[PDB]
UniProtKB/Swiss-Prot annotation:
Annotated localization: Cytoplasm, Cytosol; Sarcoplasmic reticulum membrane
Catalytic reactions of this protein: [protein]-peptidylproline (omega=180) = [protein]-peptidylproline (omega=0)
Record EC number: 5.2.1.8
Keywords attached to this entry: Acetylation, Cytoplasm, Isomerase, Membrane, Rotamase, Sarcoplasmic reticulum
Modified residues (N6-acetyllysine): 53
Record-level GO BP terms: 'de novo' protein folding; amyloid fibril formation; heart morphogenesis; heart trabecula formation; negative regulation of activin receptor signaling pathway; negative regulation of transforming growth factor beta receptor signaling pathway; positive regulation of canonical NF-kappaB signal transduction; protein folding
A molecular function GO annotation: signaling receptor inhibitor activity
Gene3D superfamilies reported for this sequence: 3.10.50.40
Recorded superkingdom: Eukaryota
Gene: FKBP1A
Stated regulation of activity: Inhibited by both FK506 and rapamycin.
UniProt-recorded name of the protein: Peptidyl-prolyl cis-trans isomerase FKBP1A
Length: 108
């Protein structure tokens, strides 16, 4: 499958990321079983990426683009939109569906 976006808390419902803008997010990354493997909240530093530059997994590029500024959403991402058959050695297993808790804090 692709990316499913479930709202946790609404944003402004009007400001959506456009290609080339920098998205500033807090995120927690979990395997489908619930195990956390990455979180910007545990580092207390928001994560920044530029949309459309493929600095993040495809699921983020298509999922975050569906979020409005200030929204918190749950992204469920199939492995083809994620780390695929290879996974990531010792962090993400092969063919892993990933769940992300993402808050879009602002655009730059």
């Amino acid at each position: 499958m692709g990316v499913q976006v479930e709202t946790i808390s609404p944003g402004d419902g009007r400001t959506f990321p456009k290609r080339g803008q920098t998205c500033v997010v807090h995120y927690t990354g979990m395997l489908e079983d619930g195990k956390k493997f990455d979180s910007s909240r545990d580092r207390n530093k928001p994560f920044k990426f530029m949309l459309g530059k493929q600095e993040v997994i495809r699921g983020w590029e298509e999922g975050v683009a569906q979020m409005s500024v200030g929204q918190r959403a749950k992204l469920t991402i199939s492995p083809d939109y994620a780390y695929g058959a290879t996974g990531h050695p010792g962090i993400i297993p092969p063919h892993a569906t990933l769940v992300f808790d993402v808050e879009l804090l602002k655009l730059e």
